[PDB]
Design a protein around this nucleic acid. Sequence first.
DNA 1: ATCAATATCCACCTGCAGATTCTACCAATGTGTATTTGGAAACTGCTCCATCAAAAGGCATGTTCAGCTGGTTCAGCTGAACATGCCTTTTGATGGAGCAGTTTCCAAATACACAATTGGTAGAATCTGCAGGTGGATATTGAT
DNA 2: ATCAATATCCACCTGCAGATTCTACCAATGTGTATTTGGAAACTGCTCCATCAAAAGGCATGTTCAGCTGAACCAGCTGAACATGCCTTTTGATGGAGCAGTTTCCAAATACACAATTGGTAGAATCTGCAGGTGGATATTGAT
Lengths: 103, 105, 79, 87, 93, 97, 98, 97
Amino acid sequence: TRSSRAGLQFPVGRVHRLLRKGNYSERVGAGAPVYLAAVLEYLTAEILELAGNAARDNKKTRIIPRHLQLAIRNDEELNKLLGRVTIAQGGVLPNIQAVLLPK
Amino acid sequence: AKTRSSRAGLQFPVGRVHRLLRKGNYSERVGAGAPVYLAAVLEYLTAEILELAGNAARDNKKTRIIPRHLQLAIRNDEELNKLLGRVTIAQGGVLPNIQAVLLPK
Amino acid sequence: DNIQGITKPAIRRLARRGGVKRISGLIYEETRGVLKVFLENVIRDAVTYTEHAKRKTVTAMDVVYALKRQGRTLYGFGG
Amino acid sequence: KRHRKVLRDNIQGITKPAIRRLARRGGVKRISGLIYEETRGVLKVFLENVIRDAVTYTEHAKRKTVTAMDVVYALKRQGRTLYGFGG
Amino acid sequence: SRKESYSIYVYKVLKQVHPDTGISSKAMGIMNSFVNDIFERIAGEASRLAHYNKRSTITSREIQTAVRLLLPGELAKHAVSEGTKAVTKYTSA
Amino acid sequence: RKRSRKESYSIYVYKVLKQVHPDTGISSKAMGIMNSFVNDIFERIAGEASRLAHYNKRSTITSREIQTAVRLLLPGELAKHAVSEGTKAVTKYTSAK
Amino acid sequence: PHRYRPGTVALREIRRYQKSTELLIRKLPFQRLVREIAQDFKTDLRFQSSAVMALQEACEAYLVGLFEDTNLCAIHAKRVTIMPKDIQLARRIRGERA
Amino acid sequence: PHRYRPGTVALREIRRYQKSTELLIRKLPFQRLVREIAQDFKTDLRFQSSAVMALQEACEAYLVGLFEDTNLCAIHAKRVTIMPKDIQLARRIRGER
DNA sequence: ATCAATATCCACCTGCAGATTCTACCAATGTGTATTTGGAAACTGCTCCATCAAAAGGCATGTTCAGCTGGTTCAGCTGAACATGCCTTTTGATGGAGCAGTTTCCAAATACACAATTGGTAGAATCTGCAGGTGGATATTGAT
DNA sequence: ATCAATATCCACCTGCAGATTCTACCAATGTGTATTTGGAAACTGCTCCATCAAAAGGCATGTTCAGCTGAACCAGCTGAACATGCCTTTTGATGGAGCAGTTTCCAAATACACAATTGGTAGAATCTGCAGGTGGATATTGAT
């Protein structure tokens, strides 16, 4: 497989196919789906990392949506990227306005 | 009729729109009904805007429609305003509008 | 009048999660208005998709295509 | 192989009155003292962003010159679309 | 080097709507840009609809469900109509 | 009963998952979230690539384009590190071939 | 007996509810409301249970978010209380409202 | 001589400026501000004059708009006066910050 | 403070189902042909940058005081807290079939290509709107 | 009031060029072959919908009173208005070429097709997390 050739877990074949049948453009170079399945692998890894640490924090082995939501909204660059995105079963970052706190 | 706009009775070219739909990669195959219906919808919205801006230019006592007129025309209308919500108009100006509580008492 | 099935305590809880302390009286009704607009819009679209699809049943994917149109993108239901 | 002047804090050329006028046209009456500096802070953020993207486009294009279309693709990217320069 | 625009057809439609009125170059730029933004919007939506329904082809039917999605209210109505009308006159002849 | 083939990323995401946290797992819901994530991101990057193609009047999507797309789409450090993983995987596939 | 001051059970409620992710609105009234709102667009329709759930997630998202932004608007007025003019301000800026 | 009360020349100004479409920020200091912001991004650039104008339009638009939403925020505070905590609420709700 | 009472926190365990490991099926996804997109080099010319002096118009800067900000108080009341009382949401259940989804046939609809021809372009010519100006009527603001 | 005075509003005019019209050159844009998409009909089955019956849990309704809101008032002061003095922007002018965009050639790179084989799917099985809960650890909240 081409992922083995490029050292990825992510299929470069499947992404070659998707770039062809989405009509993004006529000709998809051979380097494109590689670079790309790589970039997705990286960001998948990134999210899984931060979410995993968050998952060990609440003392669970299984990552549940709440963990992911936390990881994303907590990280800054990821949070920017996922701004318009609503994560199912997410919850919010527990945060209270200071001036409603009992004085 | 020879040309296709003539055949469907339009001022907007149904041919050029066929060309654009094809060499834009929207999809493999572009039906014969699509650029027709489309050059129709473009023609229609072009017409609605031009009407509203033209009346607005008559209101300011002028022969030529200038961007300020179009800006007006779009923003006074409720639906054109929603569609062009995120769009900024070159040389537009704003809707003359002042807040009440800033007005003299 | 199913619009009242959105109970006062549900909206109270929703505001709780939103980080709010004290809720006015009118608010509930006002909420109920907003909520409707939202749903009206989204579903309007979702349903359109279902109609293009010549299907009689609205599927989660229609919902998602609509939400993506609204700029409200949703993850986790089959996007 | 021929010099430039250096360019430094041209951000103060956005004069207090330009910011006052821009504020009038916004339907504003009384402007605090602080606002000017803060305006600029915001304006800068804006430009940085837009121009970043516009230049990225000029860079993809192997051109040394930024064109209106590049600007426009950028603004359209940010969700800020502009009409009248060639979209 | 030849460039392509809608300025001639927007002259047409202007004269249809207001015979005695004219239009400046900047303004024409606004229009041409406008038509184009719209084009990309609808055609895009049509396209997305294709791949959503696993169809390799863009029929007038798709443009239509696009125009229903993209256009708000009364505008959507008068437009879907002006179209159906244009396609139907096109079909017979 | 009968089968209907569906397609997803949950397997490659298990792999990458096991790479990062060997001792941790992932629920169904969360996996749906990742599947969606990859898909949205994908569509985003490829969309922008496409626009770059048409902007520059080109019939082909080169990795070069994927790249300028990622610089545009991704914020800051994320951008720098993705451009790395990509250029990297492509040079490795290049010499391998 | 025992009575907590006004506002305390609020704060404990806030911590408690912000910390979970579960669906706050009763699902059936919501489902009825969705089927109704859909009736008027097209009659005799069916709903995948997953699609209803999907909408519920979308709407509770919408509202909690709008509330964050509301609370911030009333806090802008030196007030701890959210009101209809606050919500109309939020929507008015977001672009949602005219 | 003659002196107008505080606020009269304010309203005469709002009317005057809302009524026109010409560029409020002088073009040269804006052009230096754009060549500077690009200098330090990629060095040695050239700018089509139209690109300068396009930027000017985009930015004055952004800002006039932001000022409106600011005003609506300060008026919500029962104030005739705008302040950075206002502008920052505007941007905070729009999502920018 | 120092002091009680609900409410919450965490500890331990156990079982339930949903995560995870294994099985066999199967349909997507290396070499060879033919074509063409665009990278490269060679040239043309547009327009972008630099600079300058003069014109002037707007910026800056300081004084002065008006009305706007927020600090303070203070009454009413509008929401919160808490109990009791009522109802419909939840869940599990089975049954019924609406209909979504999968397959096979196959023809109506478009891709593909060559040769024709005309609408759409640019360039040039020209002319009518109106930008710029000035005076002069009128309308508004603030002073008495 | 009544009154000047600053500013805006409104009309003609006058000259300039930008809209707009004439013109000729030219490149996108009627008919026949070839391929396959989806419409159409035929069957299978997934899960969606109905009404239903218990189990509580949540909503509702009310009483009682706390503190939040806003009306109202007052002192300080911060931002408006105005002139005058100065600076830097605008204009257009020219000159110079960086370099954008247009052209022509040559190949490295990808699409197309046939043919083969295994990663990736669903379905089945099994098993390890953690939800659910109960009971004291331990943290606040309100009253002393």
